[PDB]
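Example 331.
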Amino acid sequence: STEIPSLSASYANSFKIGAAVHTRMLQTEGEFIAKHYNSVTAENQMKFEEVHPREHEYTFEAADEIVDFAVARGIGVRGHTLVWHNQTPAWMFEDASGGTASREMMLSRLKQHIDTVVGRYKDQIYAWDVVNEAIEDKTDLIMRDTKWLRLLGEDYLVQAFNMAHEADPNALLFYNDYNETDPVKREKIYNLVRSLLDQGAPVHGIGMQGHWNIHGPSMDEIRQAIERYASLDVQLHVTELDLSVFRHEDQRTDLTEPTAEMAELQQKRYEDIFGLFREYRSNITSVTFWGVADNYTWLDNFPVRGRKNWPFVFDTELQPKDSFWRIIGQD
Ligand SMILES: O[C@@H]1[C@@H](O)[C@H](NCc2ccc(Oc3ccccc3)cc2)C=C[C@H]1O
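Predicted structure in complex with HXH:
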């Protein structure tokens, strides 16, 4: 579209290159997106609260527009989170008295939601994040204490995957999570999917969120996670990749642009990462960035409200950053 090669095309024989999108960027960044991405994920417009605000009311307008945009351009679409403890309306977990919904209610409601959401795009979504972030970060805790686990039951994951698989048996069903490289959590995610496959659950892939930063995880840590998850004979997708220039609970806030140090480390960081992905392209079939360009990122408001970040290879003006050129695939 100017002087830079299509990022997605440079990986056409390696793995998809995708981005998290929102309908608001389609009428302005649609061309840029179609040029550089052969996959898209709705950042939020396909989550439970966004498509099923009320029990008897579905609002698919936004998600439908994203799908029409992609499908008409040969662009793949990943469905994000059907079951997650966040961005899920309260009515789903409540009964008529405002009390907690029963197991039977949870099941019938989850069934209807899945059939409607997954069934709507039957054969159009190549991959669905069936369950998102079910494992704890606490060293001594395996399963995250959520309303799905409490009101539906310990088999809520098996339930979710089975219902989604019936709504569309051709879509790849993924289990998505973050801090997937941390040794302790890695083994928990590994044992989860492992146990699921053993139960006969239709889980075909593990989603490595990739919410990393210019300081970690290291190459070796990512390498072990890759090989570990891959050994399960499932596909691996990097679903929400971003490299924050800030660390956890970062105290810095006077930055209008990355420092020279940040820019240098991020550039080298992206190079090493995609170098690693190419090495494992046999296991990785899709790599999605949680955003299009630095002009917008969910990180600008999380975990610090109003703190600008620049975690992508494209800058605020949609121009390729130095990291872009170091990430161009070999096809
Ligand atoms: O849907 C994605 C989601 O999967 C992602 N998880 C990453 C993540 C998970 C937990 C987390 O931890 C906290 C959550 C709330 C409050 C404090 C910490 C921080 C990031 C975030 C972006 C969303 O668009």
